[PDB]
């Protein structure tokens, strides 16, 4: 007895079982199930994850809202033509507490996994679960938190998961600042200083025709031009986060403390 | 990829078996997984036979020696019995295909994996759960079949499925045992005449405790230990009485008795359902 699903309206489900049944029922009848996993507090970035998912012909869009340890968000999705919001409780995602989890590979130890050693294990575990519950054809992440997205690609390859992982370019303020829920915490000076991350990164990207060293130095110069910006790391890696090849396509990642607030950004880089 | 119905189809590439699996499924067939490490015996034939009796089922036996958790490797004998029981899919991946990037993303079992068999082998179950998961993801069966010999393993798998929300049913199958009670095992070939004989004491001891249990837990345990002690060259690694789910939950009326012993080199496991009272 398949749960009630009204096509073209916004259907909300809090029971995993329900969303799993609705979702399985929709695949069987043509629809391609797109998942956009969020933690609520939805901003334009999210919206651009949703929009991409709808571009896929015949798709139905699942947006989970789960706080991984408000009707305004439901309003945005309804106003976006989202047909499913999956809104489970913590006891429902975790009816037996933390038991079996995912152990990410060694890349979880670096970069962000320095300041936060266990964070990614948590991310990968909830992502596997959501992928299992919803079983989408495709799953949509912003490129902002880039390390996270790569580990997710590693989760999918490593466990032979059947989903396609789509990374959507990061949505930014007018001045380049990568969108983030933390942005509303920076006072004006900090907010104005924050502009340096993306400006460092864009500078690097364009400086890159002169090669690897000039990209890093361009970005480091820009970072240096800003007060109150404590850079935890600034690193050029290959697209999958191993060492940067002598020439080819890579990624440049930055992370920084503006007061209490930790900011991240990253960009694509071609060397030559 | 080709699928000849009513015969045995042997696929090497995960992709090959995932496509055929999915294809058969949409056309209404129900997919049954029997995960083996090969060297098939009468217990494996039971797993298959249970799988077969699920209506409109197609049966996939996987044969993979997962180097993450020495072993007898006998595919001709293995595949011969398979078409005899009328199995339609054998999945036989290479290590290359299963682990192209090596050990990377893995499964971390809960605390039950550090107990019992996990104490001296603390990365053993992570290996088991990892490859089981890979195998459920490759083949996407409706049900999956395990014998009950390796009981902790079964419970842990029930956990993998619950905690990761895998939509598959775990079917446990009663241990198939030799005429004298000895639990079927690939490790049995490794017992000489003296040891084969002594080995009967494991199943002997458990069935004695099943029956002494009317007198309580302490009597079931004492019974079972007495039989183990009266046995020549049987060194008991552990004998424990637990909840059926084996977990941080006390014993009440029903439970599970588990034993691990060594016959020289060869380590044996057995376990039994137990009712206290009853
Ligand atoms: C494509 O444009 C963007 C730009 C930034 C984005 C996003 C999209 C999406 C996010 C985001 O979802 N951040 S988050 O803290 O809500 C979040 C939500 C869900 C996860 C998991 C557990 C599903 C991986 C991680 C982070 N964020 C960062 C943020 O909103 O804090
Ligand atoms: C219902 O009858 C029985 C009785 C005993 C059984 C079995 C069935 C199955 C096994 C068994 O261990 N088979 S296995 O060694 O090939 C095997 C296969 C696959 C796993 C994984 C994939 C779950 C890790 C473990 C063991 N065994 C025990 C054994 O062969 O040692």
Coordinates of C-alpha atoms and ligand atoms in Angstrom, one line a residue:
Chain A
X1 CA 0.0 0.0 0.0
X2 CA 2.1 2.9 -1.6
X3 CA 1.9 6.3 0.2
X4 CA -0.1 9.2 -1.1
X5 CA 1.6 11.1 -3.9
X6 CA 0.0 14.1 -5.7
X7 CA 1.9 14.8 -9.0
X8 CA 2.8 18.5 -9.5
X9 CA 2.3 19.5 -5.9
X10 CA 4.8 19.4 -3.1
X11 CA 4.6 16.1 -1.2
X12 CA 6.3 16.0 2.2
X13 CA 7.3 12.7 3.8
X14 CA 9.1 12.2 7.1
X15 CA 9.1 8.4 7.1
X16 CA 12.0 6.9 5.3
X17 CA 9.8 3.9 4.3
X18 CA 7.3 6.3 2.6
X19 CA 9.8 8.2 0.5
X20 CA 11.4 4.9 -0.4
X21 CA 8.1 3.5 -1.7
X22 CA 7.1 6.7 -3.5
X23 CA 10.5 6.9 -5.1
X24 CA 10.6 3.2 -6.1
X25 CA 7.0 3.6 -7.5
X26 CA 8.2 6.6 -9.6
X27 CA 11.2 4.9 -11.2
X28 CA 9.0 2.0 -12.3
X29 CA 6.7 4.4 -14.2
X30 CA 9.3 6.3 -16.2
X31 CA 10.3 9.3 -13.9
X32 CA 14.0 9.9 -13.3
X33 CA 14.5 10.5 -9.6
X34 CA 16.8 13.4 -8.8
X35 CA 18.1 13.9 -5.3
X36 CA 19.2 17.2 -3.8
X37 CA 20.3 16.6 -0.2
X38 CA 20.3 19.7 2.0
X39 CA 20.4 20.7 5.6
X40 CA 17.6 23.3 5.4
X41 CA 18.1 27.1 5.5
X42 CA 17.9 27.1 1.8
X43 CA 19.7 29.7 -0.3
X44 CA 20.2 30.4 -4.1
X45 CA 22.9 27.7 -4.2
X46 CA 20.4 25.0 -3.3
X47 CA 18.0 26.5 -5.8
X48 CA 20.6 26.1 -8.5
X49 CA 21.0 22.4 -7.5
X50 CA 17.2 22.1 -7.9
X51 CA 17.1 23.9 -11.2
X52 CA 19.8 21.6 -12.7
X53 CA 17.9 18.5 -11.5
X54 CA 14.7 19.7 -13.2
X55 CA 16.6 20.3 -16.5
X56 CA 16.7 16.5 -16.7
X57 CA 13.7 15.5 -18.9
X58 CA 11.0 13.5 -17.0
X59 CA 12.7 14.0 -13.6
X60 CA 11.1 14.3 -10.2
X61 CA 13.1 16.2 -7.6
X62 CA 13.7 15.0 -4.1
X63 CA 15.1 17.6 -1.7
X64 CA 15.9 16.1 1.7
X65 CA 16.1 18.5 4.6
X66 CA 17.9 16.8 7.4
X67 CA 20.1 18.4 10.2
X68 CA 23.1 16.1 10.4
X69 CA 24.5 16.2 14.0
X70 CA 11.6 26.1 7.9
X71 CA 8.2 26.4 6.2
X72 CA 10.0 29.2 4.4
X73 CA 12.2 26.4 2.8
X74 CA 9.0 24.5 1.9
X75 CA 7.8 27.7 0.4
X76 CA 10.9 28.0 -1.8
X77 CA 10.6 24.4 -3.0
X78 CA 6.8 24.7 -3.6
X79 CA 7.7 27.9 -5.5
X80 CA 10.3 25.9 -7.4
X81 CA 8.1 23.0 -8.6
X82 CA 9.7 20.4 -6.3
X83 CA 7.5 17.4 -5.9
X84 CA 9.1 15.7 -2.9
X85 CA 10.6 17.0 0.3
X86 CA 12.0 14.3 2.5
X87 CA 12.1 15.6 6.1
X88 CA 13.0 12.8 8.6
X89 CA 13.7 13.1 12.3
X90 CA 17.1 12.1 13.9
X91 CA 15.5 9.0 15.6
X92 CA 14.2 8.0 12.1
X93 CA 17.5 8.3 10.3
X94 CA 19.2 6.7 13.3
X95 CA 16.7 4.2 15.1
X96 CA 19.6 2.2 16.6
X97 CA 22.1 5.1 17.0
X98 CA 25.5 5.1 15.4
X99 CA 26.2 1.5 14.7
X100 CA 27.5 0.6 11.3
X101 CA 29.2 3.6 9.7
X102 CA 31.4 4.4 6.6
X103 CA 35.1 4.8 7.1
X104 CA 36.3 7.2 4.3
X105 CA 39.7 6.5 2.8
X106 CA 42.9 8.5 3.7
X107 CA 42.0 11.7 1.9
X108 CA 39.5 12.3 4.8
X109 CA 42.6 12.7 7.0
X110 CA 43.8 15.8 5.1
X111 CA 42.8 19.4 4.5
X112 CA 39.4 19.8 6.3
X113 CA 40.0 16.5 8.1
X114 CA 42.8 18.2 10.0
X115 CA 40.7 20.8 12.0
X116 CA 37.8 18.2 12.0
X117 CA 39.1 14.5 12.1
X118 CA 35.8 12.6 12.0
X119 CA 33.5 15.0 10.2
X120 CA 33.6 13.1 6.8
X121 CA 32.8 9.7 8.2
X122 CA 29.6 11.5 9.4
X123 CA 28.9 13.0 6.0
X124 CA 29.6 9.8 4.0
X125 CA 27.4 7.7 6.4
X126 CA 24.3 10.1 6.0
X127 CA 24.9 10.3 2.3
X128 CA 25.0 6.5 1.8
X129 CA 21.8 6.3 3.8
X130 CA 20.0 9.0 1.8
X131 CA 21.1 7.3 -1.4
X132 CA 19.8 4.0 -0.1
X133 CA 16.5 5.4 1.1
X134 CA 15.8 7.5 -1.9
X135 CA 17.7 5.5 -4.6
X136 CA 18.0 8.5 -7.1
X137 CA 19.3 8.2 -10.7
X138 CA 21.3 11.3 -10.0
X139 CA 22.5 13.2 -6.9
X140 CA 23.4 16.9 -6.8
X141 CA 26.1 18.7 -4.8
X142 CA 27.6 22.2 -5.0
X143 CA 31.3 22.4 -5.8
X144 CA 31.9 24.7 -2.8
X145 CA 32.9 22.0 -0.3
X146 CA 35.1 20.3 -2.9
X147 CA 36.9 17.7 -0.7
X148 CA 33.5 16.5 0.4
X149 CA 32.2 16.0 -3.2
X150 CA 35.4 14.0 -4.1
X151 CA 35.0 11.7 -1.1
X152 CA 31.4 11.2 -2.2
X153 CA 32.7 10.2 -5.6
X154 CA 34.9 7.8 -3.8
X155 CA 32.0 6.4 -1.8
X156 CA 30.0 5.7 -5.0
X157 CA 32.9 4.1 -6.9
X158 CA 34.1 2.1 -3.9
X159 CA 30.7 0.6 -3.0
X160 CA 29.6 0.2 -6.6
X161 CA 26.6 2.5 -6.0
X162 CA 24.4 3.0 -9.0
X163 CA 23.9 6.8 -8.9
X164 CA 25.4 9.6 -10.9
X165 CA 27.1 12.3 -8.8
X166 CA 26.6 15.8 -10.4
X167 CA 28.7 18.7 -9.1
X168 CA 27.1 22.0 -9.7
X169 CA 29.4 25.1 -9.9
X170 CA 29.3 27.2 -6.7
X171 CA 26.8 30.0 -6.6
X172 CA 28.4 33.3 -5.4
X173 CA 27.5 36.8 -4.1
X174 CA 28.0 39.7 -6.6
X175 CA 31.6 40.2 -5.4
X176 CA 32.6 36.5 -5.8
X177 CA 32.1 35.3 -2.2
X178 CA 31.0 31.7 -2.3
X179 CA 27.6 31.3 -0.7
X180 CA 27.5 29.7 2.7
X181 CA 25.2 29.8 5.8
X182 CA 28.2 31.1 7.7
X183 CA 28.3 34.3 5.7
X184 CA 25.6 36.1 7.7
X185 CA 27.9 35.8 10.8
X186 CA 30.8 38.0 9.5
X187 CA 30.6 41.7 10.5
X188 CA 31.1 44.2 7.7
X189 CA 35.0 44.4 8.0
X190 CA 35.2 40.6 7.9
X191 CA 32.6 40.4 5.1
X192 CA 34.7 42.8 3.2
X193 CA 37.9 40.9 3.9
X194 CA 36.2 37.6 2.9
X195 CA 36.2 38.7 -0.7
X196 CA 39.9 37.8 -0.8
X197 CA 39.3 34.0 -0.9
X198 CA 37.5 34.0 -4.3
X199 CA 39.7 36.9 -5.5
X200 CA 42.7 34.9 -4.6
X201 CA 41.3 31.9 -6.5
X202 CA 40.2 33.7 -9.6
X203 CA 43.6 35.5 -9.7
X204 CA 45.3 32.1 -9.5
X205 CA 43.2 30.7 -12.2
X206 CA 44.2 33.4 -14.6
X207 CA 47.8 33.7 -13.4
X208 CA 48.1 29.9 -14.3
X209 CA 49.3 30.4 -17.9
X210 CA 52.6 31.3 -16.3
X211 CA 52.4 27.9 -14.5
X212 CA 52.0 26.4 -11.0
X213 CA 54.2 28.6 -8.9
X214 CA 52.7 31.9 -10.3
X215 CA 49.2 30.7 -9.6
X216 CA 49.9 30.0 -5.9
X217 CA 51.9 33.2 -5.6
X218 CA 49.1 35.3 -7.2
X219 CA 46.6 33.8 -4.7
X220 CA 49.0 34.1 -1.7
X221 CA 49.6 37.8 -2.6
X222 CA 45.9 38.4 -2.6
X223 CA 45.4 36.6 0.7
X224 CA 48.2 38.7 2.1
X225 CA 46.5 41.9 1.1
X226 CA 43.7 41.2 3.6
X227 CA 43.5 41.9 7.3
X228 CA 41.9 39.3 9.8
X229 CA 42.2 36.4 7.4
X230 CA 44.0 33.4 8.9
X231 CA 44.7 30.9 6.1
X232 CA 44.7 27.3 7.3
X233 CA 45.8 26.0 3.9
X234 CA 46.1 27.0 0.2
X235 CA 46.7 24.0 -2.0
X236 CA 46.8 23.0 -5.6
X237 CA 45.9 19.3 -6.2
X238 CA 44.7 17.3 -9.2
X239 CA 41.0 17.1 -9.9
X240 CA 40.7 14.0 -7.6
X241 CA 42.8 15.7 -4.8
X242 CA 46.0 13.7 -5.2
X243 CA 49.3 15.6 -5.9
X244 CA 49.2 18.2 -8.8
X245 CA 50.6 16.9 -12.1
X246 CA 53.4 18.9 -13.7
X247 CA 51.0 20.0 -16.4
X248 CA 47.2 19.3 -16.7
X249 CA 43.9 20.2 -15.1
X250 CA 43.8 20.7 -11.3
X251 CA 42.0 22.3 -8.4
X252 CA 43.0 25.0 -6.0
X253 CA 41.5 25.0 -2.5
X254 CA 41.6 27.6 0.3
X255 CA 40.4 27.7 3.9
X256 CA 40.5 30.6 6.4
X257 CA 39.4 31.9 9.7
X258 CA 37.8 35.3 9.8
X259 CA 37.4 35.6 13.5
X260 CA 35.2 32.7 14.7
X261 CA 34.1 31.9 11.2
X262 CA 35.8 29.4 9.0
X263 CA 35.4 29.9 5.2
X264 CA 36.2 27.7 2.3
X265 CA 36.4 28.1 -1.5
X266 CA 38.1 26.3 -4.4
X267 CA 38.5 26.6 -8.1
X268 CA 39.4 24.7 -11.3
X269 CA 42.9 25.3 -12.7
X270 CA 44.5 24.4 -16.1
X271 CA 48.4 24.4 -16.0
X272 CA 49.8 26.2 -19.0
Chain B
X1 CA 25.3 -8.9 -22.1
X2 CA 23.8 -12.3 -23.1
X3 CA 21.6 -14.3 -20.8
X4 CA 20.7 -17.9 -21.7
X5 CA 17.8 -18.9 -19.5
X6 CA 17.8 -22.4 -18.1
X7 CA 21.5 -22.6 -18.2
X8 CA 24.5 -21.3 -16.1
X9 CA 25.7 -17.9 -17.1
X10 CA 29.1 -16.9 -15.8
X11 CA 29.9 -13.2 -15.5
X12 CA 33.2 -11.6 -14.6
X13 CA 32.6 -7.9 -14.8
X14 CA 30.5 -6.3 -12.0
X15 CA 28.8 -4.2 -14.8
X16 CA 27.8 -7.5 -16.6
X17 CA 26.1 -9.0 -13.6
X18 CA 24.5 -5.6 -12.6
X19 CA 22.9 -5.1 -16.0
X20 CA 21.6 -8.6 -16.4
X21 CA 20.3 -8.4 -12.7
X22 CA 18.5 -5.2 -13.3
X23 CA 17.2 -6.5 -16.7
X24 CA 15.7 -9.7 -15.2
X25 CA 14.2 -7.7 -12.3
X26 CA 12.2 -5.3 -14.4
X27 CA 10.8 -8.2 -16.3
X28 CA 9.4 -9.4 -13.0
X29 CA 11.9 -12.1 -11.9
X30 CA 13.1 -11.9 -8.3
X31 CA 16.8 -12.0 -7.8
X32 CA 18.3 -14.2 -5.1
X33 CA 22.0 -13.8 -3.9
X34 CA 24.1 -16.6 -2.5
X35 CA 27.5 -15.1 -1.6
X36 CA 30.2 -17.7 -1.4
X37 CA 33.9 -17.9 -1.2
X38 CA 33.7 -21.0 -3.4
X39 CA 34.6 -24.6 -2.4
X40 CA 31.0 -25.4 -2.4
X41 CA 29.5 -27.9 0.0
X42 CA 26.1 -29.3 1.0
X43 CA 25.4 -26.1 3.0
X44 CA 25.9 -24.0 -0.1
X45 CA 23.6 -26.4 -1.9
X46 CA 21.1 -25.6 1.0
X47 CA 21.4 -21.8 0.5
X48 CA 20.8 -22.3 -3.2
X49 CA 17.9 -24.7 -2.6
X50 CA 16.2 -22.2 -0.3
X51 CA 16.8 -19.5 -2.9
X52 CA 15.4 -21.7 -5.7
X53 CA 12.1 -22.2 -3.8
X54 CA 11.2 -18.5 -3.9
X55 CA 8.7 -18.2 -6.8
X56 CA 9.9 -16.8 -10.2
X57 CA 13.4 -16.4 -8.6
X58 CA 16.5 -16.2 -10.5
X59 CA 19.6 -17.4 -8.5
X60 CA 23.0 -15.6 -8.6
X61 CA 25.8 -17.4 -6.8
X62 CA 28.8 -15.1 -6.3
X63 CA 32.2 -16.8 -5.9
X64 CA 34.8 -14.4 -4.5
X65 CA 37.8 -15.0 -2.2
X66 CA 38.0 -11.5 -0.6
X67 CA 41.6 -10.8 0.4
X68 CA 40.5 -8.3 3.1
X69 CA 39.5 -10.5 6.1
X70 CA 45.5 -20.1 2.4
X71 CA 42.0 -20.9 0.9
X72 CA 40.8 -23.9 -1.2
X73 CA 40.0 -22.8 -4.8
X74 CA 37.9 -25.3 -6.8
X75 CA 35.8 -23.7 -9.7
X76 CA 35.2 -26.9 -11.8
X77 CA 33.6 -28.7 -8.8
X78 CA 31.9 -25.4 -7.8
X79 CA 30.4 -24.8 -11.3
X80 CA 29.5 -28.4 -11.8
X81 CA 27.2 -28.5 -8.7
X82 CA 25.7 -25.1 -9.7
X83 CA 24.1 -26.2 -13.1
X84 CA 23.0 -29.4 -11.4
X85 CA 20.9 -27.3 -8.9
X86 CA 19.9 -25.3 -12.0
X87 CA 21.5 -22.0 -11.0
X88 CA 21.4 -19.4 -13.8
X89 CA 24.0 -16.8 -12.7
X90 CA 27.5 -17.3 -11.4
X91 CA 29.3 -14.0 -10.6
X92 CA 33.1 -14.6 -10.4
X93 CA 34.8 -11.2 -10.2
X94 CA 38.6 -10.6 -10.3
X95 CA 40.3 -8.7 -7.5
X96 CA 41.2 -6.1 -10.0
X97 CA 37.5 -5.6 -10.8
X98 CA 36.4 -5.5 -7.1
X99 CA 39.3 -3.3 -5.8
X100 CA 40.5 -1.2 -8.8
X101 CA 41.6 1.6 -6.4
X102 CA 42.6 -0.7 -3.6
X103 CA 41.2 -0.5 -0.1
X104 CA 39.8 3.0 0.2
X105 CA 36.2 3.7 1.3
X106 CA 35.3 0.9 3.8
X107 CA 32.7 -0.2 6.2
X108 CA 33.2 0.3 9.9
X109 CA 31.1 -2.3 11.8
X110 CA 29.6 -1.4 15.2
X111 CA 31.0 -2.7 18.6
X112 CA 29.8 -6.2 18.0
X113 CA 32.7 -6.7 15.5
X114 CA 35.3 -6.3 18.2
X115 CA 33.8 -9.0 20.3
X116 CA 34.0 -12.8 20.0
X117 CA 35.7 -13.6 16.6
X118 CA 36.6 -9.9 16.3
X119 CA 38.8 -9.6 19.4
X120 CA 42.0 -11.2 18.0
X121 CA 40.8 -10.2 14.4
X122 CA 39.7 -6.6 14.8
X123 CA 39.7 -5.7 11.1
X124 CA 38.1 -9.0 10.0
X125 CA 34.4 -7.9 9.9
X126 CA 35.1 -4.5 8.3
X127 CA 36.4 -6.7 5.4
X128 CA 33.3 -8.9 5.4
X129 CA 30.9 -6.0 5.6
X130 CA 32.8 -4.0 2.9
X131 CA 32.6 -6.8 0.4
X132 CA 29.1 -7.9 1.3
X133 CA 28.0 -4.3 0.7
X134 CA 29.8 -4.2 -2.6
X135 CA 28.1 -7.4 -3.5
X136 CA 24.6 -6.2 -2.6
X137 CA 25.3 -3.1 -4.6
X138 CA 26.6 -4.9 -7.8
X139 CA 23.8 -7.5 -7.9
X140 CA 20.8 -5.6 -6.2
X141 CA 19.0 -8.8 -5.0
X142 CA 15.7 -9.0 -3.3
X143 CA 16.9 -11.5 -0.8
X144 CA 20.4 -12.7 0.3
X145 CA 21.3 -16.0 1.9
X146 CA 23.6 -17.0 4.6
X147 CA 24.1 -20.2 6.6
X148 CA 23.9 -19.9 10.4
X149 CA 27.4 -21.4 11.1
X150 CA 29.0 -18.0 11.2
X151 CA 26.4 -16.5 13.4
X152 CA 28.1 -13.2 14.5
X153 CA 28.7 -12.5 10.8
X154 CA 25.0 -13.0 10.1
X155 CA 23.9 -10.6 12.8
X156 CA 26.5 -8.1 11.6
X157 CA 25.1 -8.3 8.2
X158 CA 21.6 -7.8 9.5
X159 CA 23.1 -4.6 11.0
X160 CA 24.7 -3.5 7.7
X161 CA 21.3 -3.8 6.1
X162 CA 19.4 -2.0 8.9
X163 CA 21.9 0.9 9.4
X164 CA 22.5 1.6 5.8
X165 CA 18.9 1.2 4.8
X166 CA 19.6 -1.4 2.1
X167 CA 16.3 -2.7 0.7
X168 CA 17.1 -6.4 0.8
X169 CA 15.9 -9.2 3.0
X170 CA 18.5 -11.3 4.9
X171 CA 17.6 -14.9 5.1
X172 CA 19.5 -17.0 7.6
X173 CA 19.6 -20.8 6.9
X174 CA 20.0 -23.5 9.6
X175 CA 23.5 -25.1 9.5
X176 CA 23.7 -28.2 7.5
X177 CA 25.8 -30.8 9.4
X178 CA 27.5 -34.1 8.8
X179 CA 25.7 -37.3 10.0
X180 CA 27.3 -37.0 13.4
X181 CA 26.4 -33.4 14.1
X182 CA 29.6 -31.7 12.8
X183 CA 28.8 -28.4 11.2
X184 CA 29.8 -28.1 7.5
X185 CA 33.0 -26.1 6.9
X186 CA 35.6 -25.6 4.3
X187 CA 38.0 -26.0 7.3
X188 CA 36.9 -29.6 7.8
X189 CA 39.1 -31.0 5.0
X190 CA 42.0 -29.9 7.4
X191 CA 41.1 -32.5 10.1
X192 CA 42.9 -35.9 10.2
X193 CA 41.0 -39.0 11.5
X194 CA 41.8 -38.3 15.1
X195 CA 40.8 -34.7 14.9
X196 CA 37.7 -35.4 12.7
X197 CA 36.4 -37.7 15.5
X198 CA 37.1 -35.3 18.3
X199 CA 35.4 -32.6 16.3
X200 CA 32.0 -34.0 17.0
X201 CA 32.3 -32.6 20.5
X202 CA 31.4 -29.1 19.5
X203 CA 27.9 -29.9 18.2
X204 CA 27.6 -32.6 20.9
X205 CA 28.3 -30.0 23.6
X206 CA 25.8 -27.4 22.2
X207 CA 22.9 -29.9 21.8
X208 CA 23.7 -31.1 25.4
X209 CA 23.3 -27.5 26.6
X210 CA 20.1 -27.0 24.5
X211 CA 18.6 -29.8 26.6
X212 CA 20.2 -29.1 30.0
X213 CA 18.9 -25.5 29.6
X214 CA 15.6 -26.4 31.3
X215 CA 17.7 -26.4 34.5
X216 CA 19.0 -22.9 33.7
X217 CA 21.8 -21.1 31.9
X218 CA 24.6 -22.2 34.3
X219 CA 23.6 -25.8 33.8
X220 CA 23.5 -25.5 30.0
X221 CA 27.0 -23.9 30.1
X222 CA 28.4 -26.5 32.6
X223 CA 27.0 -29.3 30.5
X224 CA 28.5 -27.9 27.3
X225 CA 31.9 -27.3 29.0
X226 CA 31.9 -30.8 30.3
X227 CA 31.6 -32.4 26.9
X228 CA 34.3 -30.0 25.6
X229 CA 36.6 -31.1 28.5
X230 CA 36.0 -34.8 28.0
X231 CA 37.2 -34.3 24.4
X232 CA 40.8 -35.2 23.3
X233 CA 42.9 -32.4 21.9
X234 CA 40.1 -29.9 21.8
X235 CA 41.2 -26.4 23.0
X236 CA 38.3 -24.1 23.7
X237 CA 39.0 -20.5 22.4
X238 CA 35.5 -19.4 23.7
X239 CA 32.1 -20.7 24.8
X240 CA 29.5 -18.0 25.3
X241 CA 25.8 -17.6 25.9
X242 CA 24.2 -14.5 24.4
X243 CA 21.1 -12.7 23.3
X244 CA 19.9 -13.8 19.8
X245 CA 21.0 -10.4 18.4
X246 CA 24.2 -11.0 20.4
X247 CA 24.0 -7.3 21.6
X248 CA 24.4 -5.0 24.7
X249 CA 21.1 -6.6 25.9
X250 CA 20.8 -9.2 28.7
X251 CA 19.7 -12.8 28.3
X252 CA 16.2 -13.7 29.2
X253 CA 14.3 -16.9 28.0
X254 CA 15.9 -17.3 24.6
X255 CA 19.4 -16.9 23.3
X256 CA 22.3 -18.3 21.3
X257 CA 25.2 -20.5 22.4
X258 CA 28.4 -20.1 20.5
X259 CA 31.7 -21.9 20.6
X260 CA 35.1 -21.5 19.0
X261 CA 37.7 -24.3 19.5
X262 CA 41.0 -25.5 17.9
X263 CA 41.9 -28.9 16.7
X264 CA 45.6 -28.5 16.4
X265 CA 46.0 -25.9 13.7
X266 CA 42.3 -25.9 12.7
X267 CA 39.9 -23.6 14.4
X268 CA 36.2 -24.5 14.4
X269 CA 33.0 -22.6 15.1
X270 CA 29.5 -23.7 16.0
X271 CA 26.4 -22.2 17.6
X272 CA 23.0 -23.1 18.6
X273 CA 19.6 -21.6 19.5
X274 CA 19.0 -22.0 23.3
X275 CA 15.9 -21.6 25.4
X276 CA 16.2 -21.1 29.2
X277 CA 13.4 -22.3 31.3
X278 CA 12.1 -23.0 28.7
Ligands
LIG1 C1 25.8 25.3 -5.9 O1 25.8 26.4 -5.0 C2 26.0 26.1 -3.7 C3 26.8 26.9 -2.9 C4 26.9 26.6 -1.5 C5 26.3 25.6 -1.0 C6 25.5 24.8 -1.7 C7 25.3 25.1 -3.0 C8 24.9 23.9 -1.0 C9 25.4 24.0 0.3 C10 25.0 23.2 1.3 O2 24.1 22.5 1.1 N1 25.7 23.4 2.4 S1 25.1 22.6 3.7 O3 25.9 23.0 5.0 O4 23.6 22.9 3.8 C11 25.2 20.9 3.6 C12 24.1 20.1 3.3 C13 24.2 18.8 3.2 C14 25.4 18.1 3.3 C15 25.4 16.7 3.1 C16 25.5 16.0 4.5 C17 24.2 16.2 2.4 C18 26.7 16.3 2.3 C19 26.5 18.8 3.5 C20 26.5 20.2 3.7 N2 26.2 25.1 0.3 C21 27.1 25.8 1.4 C22 26.2 26.3 2.5 O5 25.0 26.6 2.1 O6 26.6 26.4 3.7
LIG2 C1 23.5 -23.7 5.8 O1 24.7 -24.4 5.7 C2 25.9 -23.8 5.8 C3 26.8 -24.4 6.7 C4 28.1 -23.8 6.8 C5 28.5 -22.8 6.0 C6 27.6 -22.3 5.0 C7 26.4 -22.8 4.9 C8 28.2 -21.3 4.4 C9 29.5 -21.2 4.9 C10 30.4 -20.3 4.5 O2 31.2 -19.8 5.3 N1 30.5 -20.2 3.2 S1 31.8 -19.3 2.7 O3 33.0 -19.7 3.6 O4 32.1 -19.6 1.2 C11 31.6 -17.7 3.0 C12 31.1 -17.0 1.9 C13 30.9 -15.6 2.0 C14 31.2 -14.9 3.1 C15 31.0 -13.6 3.1 C16 31.0 -13.2 1.6 C17 29.7 -13.2 3.8 C18 32.1 -12.8 3.8 C19 31.7 -15.6 4.3 C20 31.9 -17.0 4.2 N2 29.6 -22.1 5.9 C21 30.8 -22.4 6.8 C22 32.1 -22.7 6.2 O5 32.0 -23.2 5.0 O6 33.1 -22.6 6.8

